[PDB]
């Protein structure tokens, strides 16, 4: 059984980063070489593993997280980073073992007038824990008085639209991101490769 990486990298819709998708990859052969040796990827950074040797490795499970962010935000999808994406949307742990893979998707994820469907969490009182996924839409209280779910001054919907336009500078353009995290237990290794 080949690992279904095609379902992940070649999916048609990608999630908003605040509602990032996770795909559990198990009981399959993972050919990571078809990926690292491809021209498709502007980012391919691995941590706790060498990207070349991936195909010699077995793992207990592999998770593939995916979402869209700005090109100048890909730098935040790494251990030790801070910013609106790392703090409030998708957080990698300090001891992350896996790979971060991104490519420019301006062709599919932009629209002439501005694509506004992709969102990120702008307001949150405290930082996300690693691999925490917050889908709350609770109106955010920025002032002294409770909002009780009504929008207004100091009372803000917590999610913000990216607004991707094809003529954006490259930092403002959308990038699709796949995060492979390599899980290891004292358990059977179900994802090995070649």
């Amino acid at each position: 059984n080949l690992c279904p990486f095609g379902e992940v990298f070649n999916a048609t819709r990608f999630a908003s980063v605040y509602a990032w998708n996770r795909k559990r990859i198990s009981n399959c052969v993972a050919d990571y070489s078809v990926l690292y040796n491809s021209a498709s990827f502007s980012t391919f950074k691995c941590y706790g593993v060498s990207p070349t040797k991936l195909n010699d490795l077995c793992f207990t499970n592999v998770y593939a997280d995916s979402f869209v962010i700005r090109g100048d935000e890909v730098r935040q999808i790494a251990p030790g980073q801070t910013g609106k994406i790392a703090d409030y949307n998708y957080k990698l742990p300090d001891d992350f073992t896996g790979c971060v893979i991104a490519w420019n998707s301006n062709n599919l994820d932009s629209k002439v007038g501005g694509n506004y469907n992709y969102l990120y969490r702008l307001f949150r009182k405290s930082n996300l824990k690693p691999f925490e996924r917050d889908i709350s839409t609770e109106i955010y209280q920025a002032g002294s008085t409770p909002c009780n779910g009504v929008e207004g001054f100091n009372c803000y919907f917590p999610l913000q639209s990216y607004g991707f336009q094809p003529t954006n500078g490259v930092g403002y353009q959308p990038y699709r991101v796949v995060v492979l995290s390599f899980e290891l237990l004292h358990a059977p290794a179900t994802v090995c490769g070649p």
């Epitope: 100048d72 801070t82 910013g83 609106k84 703090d87 409030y88 501005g114 702008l122 307001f123 949150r124 009182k125 405290s126 930082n127 955010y140 209280q141 920025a142 002032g143 002294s144 100091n154 803000y156 913000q160 607004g163 991707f164 336009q165 003529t167 954006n168 500078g169 490259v170 930092g171 403002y172």
Partner: antibody, heavy 118, light 108 residues
């Protein structure tokens, strides 16, 4: 209503240190993005620093490693600690509540003047 | 970084005129642009956020427009208290660069 009052400006020699304060009413400083913006005499405006509700901090390149932004939730007050001051830090310093790209800098204090001179 | 160019530096007008001020960003920033007004010895005041949204309390003769690289502030019929300096600002990437400002002064 809602207010922002800066204080702590004054005369300091190059190499000196200074802390500015920004006391807020209405806004909860710890729940907002808060930024400091400065204006050298006769010049335009320059964003210098921002603090996130969750605690992350960021800095313009001209002040990185010398200035520190912080807050005291209990006093609803924002701070900018300014170390290793230079002549070119001479400016009126404004604190502002920051709504990022949602609503930009919608409330500013009156500003406090820092003069760095020998 | 992104450069924000305001031109001209100075605009001459009379009360009642239609005034338009432009701001150009060096790369496409969609609609993430703010306009501020400032008077001598006073803090800046926000007029327009997100390129075209009018800030609460700001007279409706003020409007913003544009998307991408070229943005405009328009005052539909000038009033005496409108003579001031105007600044645009990149709102959605560090270091939140302000334009160099356009001064609105009285024609005679």
């Amino acid at each position: 209503e809602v207010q922002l009052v800066e204080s702590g400006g004054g005369l300091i020699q190059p190499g000196g240190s200074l802390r500015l304060s920004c006391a807020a009413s209405g806004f909860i400083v710890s729940s907002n993005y808060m930024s400091w913006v400065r204006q050298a005499p006769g010049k335009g405006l320059e964003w210098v620093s921002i603090i996130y509700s969750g605690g992350s901090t960021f800095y313009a390149d001209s002040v990185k490693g010398r200035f520190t932004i912080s807050r005291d939730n209990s006093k609803n007050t924002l701070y900018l600690q300014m170390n290793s001051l230079r002549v070119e830090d001479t400016a009126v310093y404004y604190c502002a509540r920051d709504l990022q790209e949602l609503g930009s800098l919608d409330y500013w204090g009156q500003g406090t003047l820092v003069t760095v001179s020998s | 970084d992104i450069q924000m160019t305001q031109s001209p530096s100075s605009v001459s007008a009379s009360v009642g005129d239609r005034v338009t001020i432009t701001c150009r960003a060096s790369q496409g920033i969609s609609s993430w642009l703010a306009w501020y007004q400032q008077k001598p010895g006073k803090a800046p005041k926000l007029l327009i956020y997100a390129a075209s949204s009018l800030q609460s309390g700001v007279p409706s003769r003020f409007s913003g427009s544009g998307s991408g690289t070229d943005f405009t502030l328009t005052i539909s019929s000038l009033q005496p208290e409108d003579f001031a300096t105007y600044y645009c600002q990149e709102a959605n990437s560090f270091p939140y660069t302000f334009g160099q400002g356009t001064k609105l002064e009285i024609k005679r």
